[PDB]
């Protein structure tokens, strides 16, 4: 009777950077996933655990949606059980992940605003974010907090220009995370 919000989350004007990713959730409605596997814009549309083709039958309790901006080369890295620059220090999925991940090819619609995190002394726990800006003191010497030798900024900026950029085309990926059955569920298929 009231279709769950999907249109604006998969199609709006502003997408946050990878280092700080918004986490939208859905409380109470019916969500026909018909538009998902239909439109050709969704390039990857790769799904794990529960079946991709028949998601209507399930009756989950809380569906969580988060949005990234990835350089495009690292899209294959988003999958669980993968290692690299961004899956270790920016966003880590649990091994038994439930849900789907979707990747676009949006370069024409969308610079210097996008920026990611590069430096840390440890990996991130699953489903954890870190809005922290403090120079990590690379050298053994104490670091005051002013840019200098052995003191590097933890955040670095992408450069997005309309080259060929087959690996460097700025991509936007949204991964749907599905929770278990805590309370009487309020989202299903029909």
């Amino acid at each position, epitope marked *: 009777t009231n279709l769950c919000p999907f249109g604006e989350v998969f199609n709006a004007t502003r997408f946050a950077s990878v280092y700080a990713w918004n986490r939208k959730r859905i409380s109470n409605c019916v969500a026909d996933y018909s538009v998902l596997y239909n439109s050709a814009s969704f390039s990857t549309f790769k799904c794990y655990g529960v079946s991709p083709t028949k998601l209507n039958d399930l009756c989950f309790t809380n569906v969580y949606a988060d949005s990234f901006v990835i350089r495009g080369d690292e899209v294959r890295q988003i999958a669980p059980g993968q*290692t*690299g*620059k961004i899956a*270790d*220090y920016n966003y880590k999925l649990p091994d038994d992940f439930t849900g789907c991940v979707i990747a676009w090819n949006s370069n024409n619609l969308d610079n210097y605003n996008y920026l990611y995190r*590069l*430096f*840390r*002394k*440890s*990996n991130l726990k699953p489903f954890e974010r870190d809005i922290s800006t403090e120079i*990590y*003191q*690379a*050298g*053994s*010497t104490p670091c005051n907090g002013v840019e200098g*030798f*052995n003191c*590097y900024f933890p955040l*670095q900026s992408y*450069g997005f*220009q309309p*080259t*060929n*950029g*087959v*690996g*460097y085309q700025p991509y936007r990926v949204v991964v749907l995370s599905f929770e278990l059955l805590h309370a009487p569920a309020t989202v299903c298929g029909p």
Partner: single-chain antibody
Amino acid sequence: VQLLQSAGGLVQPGGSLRLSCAASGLTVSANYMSWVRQAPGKGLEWVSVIYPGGSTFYADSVKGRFTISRGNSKNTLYLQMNSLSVEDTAVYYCARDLSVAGAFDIWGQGTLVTVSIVLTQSPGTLSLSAGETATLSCRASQSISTDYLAWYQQKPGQAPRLLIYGASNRAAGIPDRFSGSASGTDFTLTISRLEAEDLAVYYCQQYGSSPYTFGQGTKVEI
């Protein structure tokens, strides 16, 4: 700050060996490390990277025969070798890795082991007299961003160092005689007021794109 190495010898094929890269004034547990191979005359190559978190990668060409390890109890980096082949003989370097703010700020001293995307540098030899500008151009096989590429110089019998990092950005301690440009897929390096001290070989290197690749190598001549 100084990096030092301790290994070497003569080993028959299939034998074992290990190499130690010990640091001073630079913590190894929190900073990137990388091992590179210099074949006897071919050029340079990339062998491994250890991220600070603990993750490790390897060169796609050879991964099983090597195994890199991190040691935090001695601020050092051990590299272990399963077995050796005749094709594997080369001199080895260990160098700190910075992704964008510089590429390889510091380099080791070099140890010897024996056995019992594409880049191209156009000019080639470019033998010119003193005081004459020498122009070197490195072209990429595929389209690349203006950043993500560096420029290295190898004095004879010396460890490699960098001159210009990230297109035209100049690192500390380098005279202002070097300033490279960036236009499309063609990159150039210019040396002004040529001096007899700078007889060496220059390499163009890319980072971040893929398993790191180095150019064939060109030698300036006086």
